[PDB]
């Protein structure tokens, strides 16, 4: 049975296994009644899941009268698609439709944090805003990128510079997408997952700690014909993940302050990110950022050394990097390292920086980011 | 300075000359910020930009730290409401030293074009930043700037891409009407009349009696040294009457708000054909007459009122037939067929229209459903 989570006090998230093949299509033409449905995704994810829906759709589609339409759009993969250019193409394609897609349109963003942010924004402006729904296919996008309504596109001058806040009418979470998801991508998203637990529930973090081996194996497992990747670990998985989504959903319904706690490990993660990108992923930087930011709390006497080692353990126990000198990261970027001045500078692109400090695993020092001295920061970065 | 409230919160502040002495101060006061981006077109700009730089620097330096005023001048015309211009303004704002931040407060100084464009720009810059309306067109003062509707055009259509973004303040300096082109004034008057026609019988009447007065002040060639000296109240009244209403219907939130489309149902079909030689209010004026004639045809509206509406429109310089010579000269060769108009009304399959029961009293609290056949008579 699907689990329903609420955002901004309203039905929104519906999670379970395989909602894609048998749920979305019907649930759409039911709740999101419309005559036109524009699906957007990238060739990568598309080619793997597009066919299934065209079937699921036509199915539930023709069942009703008149039958609505499904127009599909495939954009190139990569961060390069979140651009003023494609957005317009998308729009233009839509207006070009016969008949042109109208305000009654219901857009479906099927993808990771990229297709999400892009399609969300597209909807947010098409004829001053039209309905849309999230169908994250990335772990991260499932527990973050798709919850909150934050949408945007990049500019050669920066990322997420142009966009808007546009809440999706529905956020379908089909855990099966994680079957085909690249292992590195899974492990990437896990960072957020952990982040979540670390600032909300001690019990949750602990469970994570236990399930690691279990979950990790599955992802790395060899799927025998006829099978489904997570057969047997469904609840352990579904639980741990929704745990995060649930939290993000909660904090979004509240915040400005509380919502700042979602930036744990990010304060430093982003400074690292700026340098190690794009060879290194987000969650990868955030993972290290978390460790570093964790070490910082202890340094200020807030966090117990015990917990610092516990966070490091959990991260690495899931395949996440824990130091800037991580051997795997090295071979991935020959000729690149993060000076302390570069880090501290990158952080300034946001005398005293604001940071989420943990009092203990599950309990943040405050209900928001605290102000730390540039000097104290400089010591956790110091070799 | 009179203040009208929209969406249960004062945001419209009207009076004469707020520009030269009010906005600048009121901004750094209520819209506290460190960066103020002004956008306008060369036409309107060159005429009023200098004054503000003074008014700003003034009230600006009178505080510490002192905020900045960055100005942007775009070409005049409907051509500026484009994926393009907007993109250039966003880049421009990002290319700044320092880059324009989220604390930015944008000022849209212009007519329905600069308004819709700048409004949208703000609506997306870093997911949305504050902004305020400073309409310089009669129409924009009583419509285009009230409601938060913003957008840009696409070679595939107008207002196809945009968003709803409420301005934090809507300054209405009636003086802008001094320099406003006469044809432009008369253009905006259409809405003004539309307003009264669907809300207050008394208001429409005042409009009538005031025709000669207001029109003269307009057509009149003002010697050096103002334009409406002596007619300020008559004018300020009539105009705010409209704004007031639009503010009300917008704040009353799918009903009462469809009534703002009176004369438009047909006005737009005409518009599509006679544009761009013919203006909006010009088409709407004719559209009103036609839609007025339609109500009477269905037995709703009194023939008396029809003529009354026709009279008022023309008494203000507005066109009243697709045969108006003034029109056909600028439209030599472009005639609107009964099907062509019916076809253009389709682009908005059954046909809904605001019907008047009487001047000041609409038939219903929204647009009614009329037979394509009954419509086919009003046209040609
Ligand atoms: N709240 C927010 O709006 C928010 C928050 C954080 C980050 N972000 C955005 O998130 C983006 C990063 O997104 P991401 O990490 O999800 O990565 P992504 O969107 O780049 O997707 C990662 C890769 O997975 C592939 N893929 C998608 N799911 C797959 C599946 N199930 N099977 C096979 N291949 C699959 C894609 O082709 C892609 O190459 C950033 O660009 C950023 O702008 C947004
Ligand atoms: N947001 C809404 O709900 C809404 C509603 C109605 C109209 N509109 C939009 O409004 C636009 C039409 O705008 P408009 O009728 O204000 O026309 P406009 O802005 O094009 O103004 C006409 C001309 O007057 C000049 N001008 C402006 N005011 C002046 C003044 N007082 N002094 C000197 N010159 C002046 C301009 O440079 C321009 O060339 C359309 O594009 C339409 O989509 C929007
Ligand atoms: Cl189809
Ligand atoms: Cl709808
Ligand atoms: Cl952000
Ligand atoms: Cl919603
Ligand atoms: Cl098992
Ligand atoms: Cl690089
Ligand atoms: Cl302690
Ligand atoms: Cl540096
Ligand atoms: Cl410029
Ligand atoms: Cl022009
Ligand atoms: Cl920037
Ligand atoms: Cl510049
Ligand atoms: Cl507001
Ligand atoms: Cl046409
Ligand atoms: Zn993140
Ligand atoms: Zn109008």
UniProtKB/Swiss-Prot annotation, chain A:
Residue numbers annotated as active site: 270 (proton acceptor)
Subcellular location: Cytoplasm
Annotated positions binding 7-phospho-2-dehydro-3-deoxy-D-arabino-heptonate: 128, 144, 150, 160, 192-195, 248, 259-263, 266, 282
Family: In the N-terminal section; belongs to the sugar phosphate cyclases superfamily. Dehydroquinate synthase family.
Binding residues for Zn(2+): 192, 266, 282
Domain of life of the organism encoding this protein: Eukaryota
Positions spanned in the full protein: 3 to 393 of 1583
Name this protein carries in UniProt: Pentafunctional AROM polypeptide
Function (record text): The AROM polypeptide catalyzes 5 consecutive enzymatic reactions in prechorismate polyaromatic amino acid biosynthesis.
Subunit note: Homodimer.
Region entry 3-dehydroquinate synthase, spans: 1-374
Residues reported to bind NAD(+): 42-44, 79-82, 112-114, 117, 137-138, 159, 177-180, 188
């Amino acid at each position: 049975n699907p689990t329903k989570i609420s955002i901004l006090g309203r039905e929104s998230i519906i999670a379970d296994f395989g909602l894609w093949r048998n749920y979305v299509a019907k649930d759409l033409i039911s709740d999101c009644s419309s005559t036109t449905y524009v699906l957007v995704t990238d060739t990568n994810i598309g080619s793997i899941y597009t066919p299934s829906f065209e079937e699921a759709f036509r199915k539930r589609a023709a069942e009703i009268t008149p039958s609505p339409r499904l127009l599909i759009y495939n954009r190139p993969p990569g961060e390069v698609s979140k651009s003023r250019q494609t957005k317009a193409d998308i729009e233009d394609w839509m207006l070009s439709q016969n008949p042109p897609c109208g305000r009654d349109t219901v857009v479906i963003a099927l993808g990771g944090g990229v297709i999400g942010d892009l399609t969300g924004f597209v909807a947010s402006t098409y004829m001053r805003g039209v309905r849309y729904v999230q169908v994250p296919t990335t772990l991260l996008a499932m527990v973050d990128s798709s919850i909150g309504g934050k949408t945007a596109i990049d500019t050669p001058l920066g990322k997420n510079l142009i966009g808007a806040i546009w809440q999706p009418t529905k956020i379908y979470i089909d855990l099966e997408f994680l079957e085909t998801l690249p292992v590195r991508e899974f492990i990437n998203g896990m960072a957020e997952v952990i982040k979540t637990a670390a600032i909300s529930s001690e019990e949750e973090f602990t469970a994570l700690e236990e399930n690691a081996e279990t979950i990790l194996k599955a992802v790395r497992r060899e799927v025998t014909p006829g099978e489904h990747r997570f057969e047997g670990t469904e609840e352990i998985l579904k639980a741990r993940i929704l745990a995060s989504a649930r939290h993000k959903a909660y904090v979004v319904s509240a915040d400005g302050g509380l919502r700042n706690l979602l930036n744990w490990g990010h304060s430093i993660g982003h400074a690292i990110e700026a340098i190690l990108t794009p060879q290194i992923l987000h969650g990868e930087c955030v993972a290290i950022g978390m460790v570093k930011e964790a070490e910082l709390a202890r340094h200020l006497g807030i966090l117990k050394g015990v917990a610092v080692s516990r966070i490091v353990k959990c991260l690495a126990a899931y395949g996440l990097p824990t130091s800037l000198k991580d051997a795997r990261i090295r071979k991935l970027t020959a000729g690149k390292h993060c000076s302390v001045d570069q880090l501290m500078f990158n952080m300034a692109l946001d005398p005293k920086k604001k940071i989420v400090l943990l009092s203990a695993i599950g309990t943040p020092y405050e209900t928001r980011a605290s102000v730390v001295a540039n000097e104290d920061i400089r010591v956790v970065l110091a070799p």
